[PDB]
Structure formats: structure tokens, C-alpha cells
Design a protein around this ligand. Structure first.
Ligand SMILES: O=C(NO)c1ccc(Cn2c3c(c4cc(F)ccc42)S[C@@H](c2ccccc2)C3)s1
Ligand SMILES: [K+]
Ligand SMILES: [K+]
Ligand SMILES: [Zn+2]
Length: 399
């Protein structure tokens, strides 16, 4: 079927307006365009509303009205340059709109744009216009109902998933490949068995955000959502092959047992060896990149799939990975080989890919069993609670 991608003049401007991510979205979309992939991709325009009331209703489907009000006020205050009052500082602090989530003149428009993009992508999948939609302007998994966290202000992912499950028994599998635990998305659906969340991440004492590991039992959801939240915490230094072998059987087993109506994939690029975090050692190599291995396996299920961005602080290498992810998605969905030159094509941001100007990232690659057994038990428990019938032998053999 069609492969959708979210972009537009306003969307590009708004996604490039944040001080933290700067022009990362521009580099990603321009590298995709420079490799002549845009004519293969169906443009999905960001969702717009008919009234401020309809926008509020859509955003407050997850977030509190007072939090959205505070975020709007923060944008207004940063627009008309004037110091915050003591009461303003206190209000912003109550919503964690202070330290890691500072104000800036376009903070609300930037945050809302990601929601508009991911909601439009969800709709495009629901009406069966595209089989896969990509939104490199989205993937902000940390935002909570009444709290900004990790430069995530509004949770585009939660609102997209909510729209998918609200459509016409619908089940959504969320896969979070970001370096960081997808705490916001996990928490939002903590009580739902219809939305299964799976985050693979680094966890270590004091490492953001501190969740998605032991606390000495593994929390995995509550009430009807019990056993429905999956986490694979991994130690520092893991490469393409070990990461692939760690998550491969989990993805296969989750797809087989859940039989999802939709798959939502957060594809945060901060696991790359060349990310300034310097924690994981993943690449964008395609002859194999763990990212490309995971995406190819997910797409092989032939389930309507939403692919989002997220983390990734090496902007050129994030662009190199996500261009490869967009080419692979076209190949797997349309069955059309997308030949990509090892040399970065001439375009606006060509100099940003120096000094080698190659598509492959400059890197030479060189405990899980216990997690696999635990996750196999959790998946059995999930199936037993929700009365899902599956071949226990088939799932066992995958690991
Ligand atoms: O990727 C994430 N979620 O998936 C993140 C959540 C919170 C994060 C932490 N984090 C980081 C920065 C930052 C800036 C912010 F305004 C808010 C959160 C921030 S500078 C970045 C860095 C790392 C190593 C070397 C130099 C710079 C780390 S990143
Ligand atoms: K993750
Ligand atoms: K859940
Ligand atoms: Zn991250």
C-alpha cells in the first residue's frame, strides 16, 4: 500500500523552532528529499481544528486543562519579553516547565505541531489511505498528563494511540526503541490491556528517567492492564547484533500473542554509537543496523504501522539513520528497491555531513537470557488474564 510521511511549510518551521532540537527536522526531511524518496511518499498534512474548543478537547483527551492553560501562558509570557512574576514561576514549577523543559517563544505551537502530525498519521492509517505513516516531527514519549519531562511538553504518541484504539476489538502494540524508557506512554496505558507497551532502553542508577527496570519486582501494569507493560533494560555498550538478538524474539512473540490492529514505533536515534550520550553502539549500516533489523521485522507483520522520531542529538547521524529507515519502509511496503548512494547528495545541509560526507555513520562495531525468561512468563500471564489462545511451543522456540 501507500507509505505516508508528515511535512508542510508551517510544520517544518514549527518543528525547527525549539532551542534543543534546532533544525534537526529540516536536515532529516532535506536528506530524505536529496535521496529522491519524496515522490514515493504520500504527503500527510498535519491535522488542524475548526475551533480552539475542538483543539482543547483533542489535547485534553490525555492532558489536564490546567496543564494546557499553563503551557499556553508560558508561550505568551516568552513572546512578550518580560520577567516571570513569583506566582508565574511557582505555577510553571508545579508543571515541571522550568529546568529540562524551559519556556521559549513557540513552546506551545512547537509542542502542538507534533500532536497535529501524529494525529493526522493515525487518521491516515485508520481510513486505510496509507499502510505505514512516518512522522519525524513526533515521538515525545516522556510528556505526562500534567507534567513536561525530558523536553517533551505534549505526548503526541499517547493521543495518536488513543485515536487508534478509539477507532473500529482494536489492540495497539507500542514499541519504544529510544535509548530512554518510554515512561509517559507506558504510564498513560498502565491500566489498559488493549494498548501493550514495550520499551527497550538503557537503565542505570541516576540515568533519566529512572523507570523501566527493577524497583526487587518488575511492575508491568495494574488492574485490567496487568502484565501489559514490557521493559528490557540493557547495560551500556550493546552493539547492533546483541541489541537485535535481545529484542527480536520479544517483538515476534508480542506480535504473535497480541495480534495487534496497529503498531506504533518510537524510533529515537540516541542509541547510535555517535550520539553524544555514548551509551549504546547501534549504527545505520545496511548491507545490519539494529534499528533497521527491528523496523524490517515489524513491517514484515503487514500490520498498519505508525513510525515516529524522538531522541537523537547527533543531527546529521539522526538524519542518516531516519533516511535509511524511510528507504527500508518504502522497500518493505511498496516492494520497490530504493537504491541509496553511499555519498551524501548535494543539498542545502551538505556541509553538515563533513568531513567524510558518507551515509554510513563513522563507527566500526566490535543477563539478557534472564530478561527473556521473565518476559516469556509475563507474556504467558498477559495471555492467561486476557484469555488469548496461542501456540506456547511456537513462542518458546523464538527465544
Ligand atoms: O532522549 C531523550 N528521551 O528519549 C531525553 C530525555 C531527557 C534528556 C536529557 N537531556 C539532555 C540534554 C537536554 C536538554 C533539555 F532541554 C532537556 C533534556 C536534556 S543535552 C543532552 C546531552 C547528552 C550528552 C552530551 C551532551 C548533551 C542530554 S534527552
Ligand atoms: K526506549
Ligand atoms: K498497557
Ligand atoms: Zn532518548
Amino acid at each position: 500500500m501507500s507509505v505516508g510521511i508528515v511535512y508542510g511549510d508551517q510544520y517544518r518551521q514549527l518543528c525547527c523552532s525549539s532551542p534543543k532540537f534546532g533544525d534537526r527536522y529540516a536536515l532529516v526531511m532535506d536528506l530524505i528529499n536529496a535521496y529522491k524518496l519524496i515522490p514515493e511518499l504520500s504527503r500527510v498534512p498535519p491535522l488542524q481544528w475548526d475551533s480552539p474548543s475542538r483543539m482543547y478537547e483533542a489535547v485534553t483527551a490525555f492532558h489536564s486543562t490546567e496543564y494546557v492553560d499553563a503551557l499556553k501562558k508560558l508561550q505568551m509570557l516568552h513572546c512578550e519579553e518580560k520577567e516571570l512574576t513569583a506566582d508565574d514561576e511557582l505555577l510553571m514549577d508545579s508543571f515541571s516547565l522550568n529546568y529540562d523543559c524551559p519556556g521559549f517563544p513557540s513552546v506551545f505551537d512547537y509542542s502542538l505541531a507534533a500532536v497535529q502530525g501524529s494525529l493526522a498519521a493515525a487518521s491516515a492509517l485508520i481510513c486505510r489511505h496509507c499502510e505505514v505513516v512516518i512522522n519525524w516531527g513526533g515521538g515525545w514519549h516522556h510528556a505526562k498528563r500534567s507534567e513536561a519531562s525530558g523536553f517533551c511538553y505534549l505526548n503526541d504518541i499517547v493521543l495518536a494511540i488513543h485515536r487508534l484504539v478509539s477507532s473500529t476489538q482494536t489492540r495497539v502494540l507500542y514499541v519504544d526503541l529510544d535509548l530512554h524508557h518510554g515512561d509517559g506512554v507506558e504510564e498513560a496505558f498502565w491500566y489498559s490491556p488493549r494498548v501493550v507497551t514495550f520499551s527497550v532502553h538503557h537503565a542505570s542508577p541516576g540515568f533519566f528517567p529512572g523507570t523501566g527496570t527493577w524497583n526487587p519486582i518488575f511492575l508491568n501494569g495494574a488492574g485490567r492492564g496487568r502484565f501489559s507493560a514490557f521493559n528490557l533494560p540493557l547495560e551500556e555498550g550493546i552493539n547492533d547484533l546483541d541489541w537485535s538478538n535481545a529484542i527480536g524474539p520479544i517483538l515476534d512473540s508480542l506480535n504473535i500473542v497480541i495480534q495487534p490492529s496497529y503498531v506504533v514505533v518510537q524510533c529515537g536515534a540516541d542509541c547510535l554509537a555517535t550520539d553524544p550520550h555514548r551509551i549504546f553502539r547501534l549504527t545505520n549500516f545496511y548491507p545490519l543496523s539494529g534499528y533497521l533489523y527491528a523496523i524490517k521485522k515489524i513491517l514484515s507483520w503487514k500490520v498498519p504501522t505508525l513510525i515516529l522520531g524522538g531522541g537523537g542529538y547527533n543531527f546529521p547521524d539522526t538524519a542518516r539513520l531516519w533516511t535509511r529507515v524511510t528507504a527500508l519502509t518504502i522497500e518493505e511496503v511498496k516492494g520497490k528497491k530504493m537504491t541509496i548512494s553511499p555519498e551524501i547528495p548535494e543539498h542545502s545541509y551538505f556541509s553538515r555531513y563533513g568531513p567524510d560526507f558518507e551515509l554510513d555513520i563513522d563507527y566500526f562495531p566490535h543477563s539478557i537470557q534472564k530478561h527473556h525468561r521473565r518476559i516469556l512468563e509475563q507474556l504467558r500471564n498477559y495471555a492467561d488474564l486476557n484469555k488469548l489462545i496461542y501456540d506456547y511451543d511456537q513462542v518458546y522456540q523464538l527465544y
